[PDB]
Design a protein around this ligand. Structure first.
Ligand code: RMI
Ligand code: RMI
Ligand code: CL
Lengths: 300, 296
């Protein structure tokens, strides 16, 4: 019993964190086999950030300009290449702590653990989700760039995010491990703003099923709804549309609790209309959207 | 920017988790040097233990079976002497924490770490954890520099869904016993010094709507706080909040008048750090650590 925001154990990722220095800029790198992956803006000065020409900046660099430090040991850079917004530094030593891993690009609504690092040293681990507007609501300070997001399903680490920047509203933007940004962002100091954010509907419904599994039923009702009527109501509260794929994904939790997805959609509509009335659901006074249907089944 | 419930990196603890089986019972153990620590309920405990032999305890570290060469009981923890020292044993200490203090939990099943979360020792000595059957022996910890301080070992779930356990010397937190009997957590209270620390974290992050021009005496604040089931605020707590008070320019008793108005009037449809409730599971040290980026 109980329901917590749970992160994956970070050990397999801690053994991969290194510090990367280029000129006056220092950030974090991910050392897997003989390659260190880091944001390409490590080659930039703050002056270069408005309109950097990364190809022009990188051709001017030599291997010995990149200072890589793994713990108290200096790694030797023997090559470099740029792949989208990530720099891949070939090193002379393979990481003996390299776990079984994959690079995965996630969709909005998906959750992952973040190992926040500074100077190649892990400082903390927290759980978060890719927002519908492609930002993450992280907890990051200057020097956290290169900190990674991951999932550990079984013994394989799936790296899905690398931190690159903080937007003016305090939210964060980054790329997958192939250097492709999530969202319409660029690694440039230019007028960029996150689009209006919305609530991850399929995740709130999963969390309502978690509340039912944990004994809480106060919010249930005798009503059902059509998917279209639910979406018409949900849009008004800045909730993401619920698709038939989401209804299908909620099938197992619906079968376990005996509450049809559209019946649970009707409790959600009522909660949006009424508020919580001094009550809580799983210790929260707000509707939680950072637990996927998969996370609920795994934890409960 | 941003404020998350953050746990310590769990790596140094993952390398210590093992599975312990005795008869039909399987739970988790903590392998430090040549000793495996686990809840004694895995087996009148001294009468039950005298009947056991070393080979009855099946200890598994990954895909390797460890040989038990001895055993002893210390309070509610069983200490299994093994023939192999853990090469991954980190620098560690066993520490007993106070209510209000926070720690990270590495939840395990079958000696395998499944998750890490951050939590607080409630004033009623329970923890609001997330645990299923088989989680027993999962440990709570903090990290100071490169030293792991083990402070909690999970033993059981109470009827209300909250959890109870011991320090690593086997002493329970709270008035609990490790047996099947009618036990209930006492009425819980809010950790006042922690809510104030989280209000300072909100100010540091740009959330100031709850600030007011007023101040209060410590006595008047405590008279009001005792009415809302909030823990008393001591002069030690006021002293501990000193650094955050100096950084934000808001005196502790000035922040108390804000908390008093929040208790009497409510949040009024507003949120603080994305929450509609007052959060009490961040200590003043956790706030300074997260808002400064201390590493391990
Ligand atoms: C001042 N106040 C907002 C405190 C927090 O300050 C910060 C300041 C910087 C942060 C950061 N770094 C960058 O954004 C660097 C950068 C700049 C332009 C483009 C790119 Cl691609 C990269 C990352 N994460 C968090 C950061 C919090
Ligand atoms: C509510 N229930 C239907 C679902 C959750 O099931 C549980 C069931 C058991 C849980 C558990 N184990 C024990 O309590 C075992 C035990 C029994 C009596 C005395 C002692 Cl000292 C130990 C630990 N942590 C979580 C547990 C969640
Ligand atoms: Cl995905």
């Amino acid at each position: 019993s109980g329901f917590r925001k749970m992160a994956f154990p970070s050990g397999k990722v801690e053994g991969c964190m290194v510090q990367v220095t280029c000129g006056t800029t220092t950030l974090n790198g991910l050392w897997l086999d003989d390659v260190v992956y880091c944001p390409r803006h490590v080659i930039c000065t703050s002056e270069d950030m408005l309109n950097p020409n990364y190809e022009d900046l990188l051709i001017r660099k030599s291997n010995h300009n990149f200072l890589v430090q793994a713990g108290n040991v200096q790694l030797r850079v023997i090559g470099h290449s740029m792949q989208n917004c990530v720099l891949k530094l070939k090193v002379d030593t393979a990481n003996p702590k390299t776990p079984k891993y994959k690079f995965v690009r996630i969709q909005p609504g998906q959750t992952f653990s973040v190992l926040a690092c500074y100077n190649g040293s892990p400082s903390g681990v927290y759980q978060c989700a890719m927002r519908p507007n492609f930002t993450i609501k992280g907890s990051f300070l200057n020097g956290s760039c290169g900190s990674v997001g991951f999932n550990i399903d079984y013994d394989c680490v799936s790296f899905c995010y690398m931190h690159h920047m903080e937007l003016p509203t305090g939210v964060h933007a980054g790329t997958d491990l192939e250097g492709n940004f999530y969202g319409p962002f660029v690694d440039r100091q230019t007028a960029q703003a996150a689009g209006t954010d919305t609530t991850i509907t399929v995740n709130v419904l999963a969390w309502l099923y978690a509340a039912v599994i944990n004994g809480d039923r106060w919010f249930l009702n005798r009503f059902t709804t059509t998917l279209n009527d639910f979406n018409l109501v949900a849009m008004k509260y800045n909730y993401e549309p619920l698709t038939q794929d989401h209804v299908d994904i909620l099938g197992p939790l619906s079968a376990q609790t005996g509450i049809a997805v559209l019946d649970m959609c009707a409790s959600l509509k009522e909660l949006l209309q009424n508020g919580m009335n001094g009550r809580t659901i799983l210790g929260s006074a707000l509707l939680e959207d950072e637990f996927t249907p998969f996370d609920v089944v795994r934890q409960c």
